[PDB]
Structure formats: C-alpha cells, structure tokens
C-alpha cells in the first residue's frame, strides 16, 4: 500500500500540522464541555428538542437507480434528513493552536461530508446538524484544536485575529461573546456564536498557558518558529510552484525534466 505522509518539515509547527492532518492521531483533550453546552453556544437548536428536517428520510424519498451514488454510505444526519448548520471559528495570529487553512485541511481529511471555508480571520465548517454537533464536541471544542483565549466560536462580527491580545490573553471580540472570570480563572461564554445573550453562562475552561501554546500552534512566527528554520516546507512550496508553472507552459515529460 501507501503510507501517507501529511506535511513536510522538521519543526514543531510542521509536526503539529501533520498531527492535525492525521486522522489516526488522537488529539489531546484539554477540557470537558457537555453536549448541551456546545449546542447552547452553537445557538442553532434548543437542547432536548428534536432536529428540524429539510427533507424526508432517504428511505421515504424515492430516487432513481444509481449504482455509483449508492456505493457511498450517507451520514446519519443525511439518513434521517436534517438541516445543514455551521460552526465558525476565529483564530488569533498570536500562537492559536489551530489556524484557518490548517483547520480546513484537517476537517476535510478527518470528517465526512463537510463544507470547509477559509478566510483570513474566519473559518467555517458546514454539515448536517447531528453530525456537526458530534464532531464539534468530540474534535472542535474539547481537544487541543481549541483554546478559549486565542480562539473562539463566533459568527456575525468577526475581528481581532490580527490584533494583539487583551490583558487576560484573550482574542479581541467586538461583541464580547466570552469573558474572563478571575475568581475561577476560567473563560465563560455569556453569548452564543452569533451574539444573543445566554441565560446561563457556560464554562469553556481556562486559557491554555503560553508555553503549551508555543508547542501546539500551527502558525509560523518570528517570535516563535519561523519558516527560515524549516527549509523543507519552503522547498516543497517552491517545487509546487515550479511544477504548476511548467505544467501551465507545456505539460510534457521533456519540459518537466527541468523540475
């Protein structure tokens, strides 16, 4: 067979990117947020009530006979028939453990039937509501992919990914969805990801210490680990660029001899 490498490089940032891309790597969990708390921060549905449906279950609807379409097993939320919801994250440039393109690549490498979108200060994944809640609790919130200070589940107004951290080390939030409770040392979400206030604040845990954030981040920084210390990634990027250029010029084997 083929043993899959995931990312070039020898530094800790490349190792963290490889770990995020690896579906067989168990991400270290750092907090326990209950399922109903994740649902409440998500703000899509009331916990305890049934999922809203967009179509009948796949057994009820009649489709044409398609051999290639029926080879793929659908998701459970697709089997019952559920609306497609989203969960959106903002990641600070100051050593957040997960980063937008890294998030999108890891989501599309690890999860089935997801819709990943990458912006500079935004990253959103869309899926059926039950499966989306499942991997939001299991992977997105409780593991080392999330830090309540340098990252945040937020839709609507997103700003502060490139700004400096506040006095408590948290990312800037124009709507202030999550605040810092100095009596317990924990970050508490007082609003959901879109902005309406929550009736009961939910503990997402305490901020990750900066020393651990240096080890678990996936961003390259001059004050942390720079790409000049990782020449293998730059060489792979340059090889990809040269291969694209040679393929766009003349896509033959003799023109790729100068690769």
């Amino acid at each position: 067979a083929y043993t899959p490498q995931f990312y070039p490089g020898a530094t800790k940032v490349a190792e963290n990117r490889r770990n995020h891309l690896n579906p067989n790597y168990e991400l270290e969990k750092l907090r326990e947020i209950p399922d109903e708390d994740v649902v409440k921060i998500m703000g899509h549905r009331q916990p305890g009530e049934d999922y809203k449906t967009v179509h009948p279950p796949l057994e009820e609807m009649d489709f044409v006979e398609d051999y290639a379409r029926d080879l793929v097993e659908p998701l459970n939320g697709a089997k019952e028939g559920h609306r497609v919801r989203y969960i959106q994250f903002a990641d600070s440039m100051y050593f957040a453990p997960a980063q937008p393109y890294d998030r999108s690549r890891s989501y599309m490498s690890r999860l089935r039937g997801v819709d990943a979108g990458t912006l500079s200060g935004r990253q959103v994944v869309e899926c059926r509501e039950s499966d989306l809640e499942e991997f939001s609790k299991n992977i997105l919130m409780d593991t080392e992919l999330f830090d309540p200070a340098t990252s945040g589940m937020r839709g609507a107004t997103v700003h502060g990914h490139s700004l400096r951290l506040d006095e408590n080390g948290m990312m800037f939030d124009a709507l202030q969805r999550c605040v810092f409770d100095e009596k317990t040392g924990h970050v508490m979400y007082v609003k959901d990801q879109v902005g309406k206030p929550l009736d009961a604040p939910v503990d997402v845990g305490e901020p990750i210490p900066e020393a651990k954030l240096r080890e678990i981040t996936t961003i390259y920084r001059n004050d942390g680990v720079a790409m000049r210390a990782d020449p293998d990634v730059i060489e792979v990027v340059k090889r990809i660029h040269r291969a694209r250029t040679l393929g766009g010029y003349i896509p033959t084997n003799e023109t790729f001899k100068g690769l």
């Binding site: 796949l58 379409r69 080879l71 793929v72 097993e73 659908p74 998701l75 697709a78 497609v84 089935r112 039937g113 997801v114 819709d115 869309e126 899926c127 059926r128």
Partner: peptide, 8 residues
C-alpha cells in the same frame, strides 16, 4: 454522497 447535499 456522505452528506447527500450538493453544497460541498
């Protein structure tokens, strides 16, 4: 086919 949705 996993999602059964054409938005992906």
């Amino acid at each position: 086919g996993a999602a059964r949705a054409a938005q992906n």
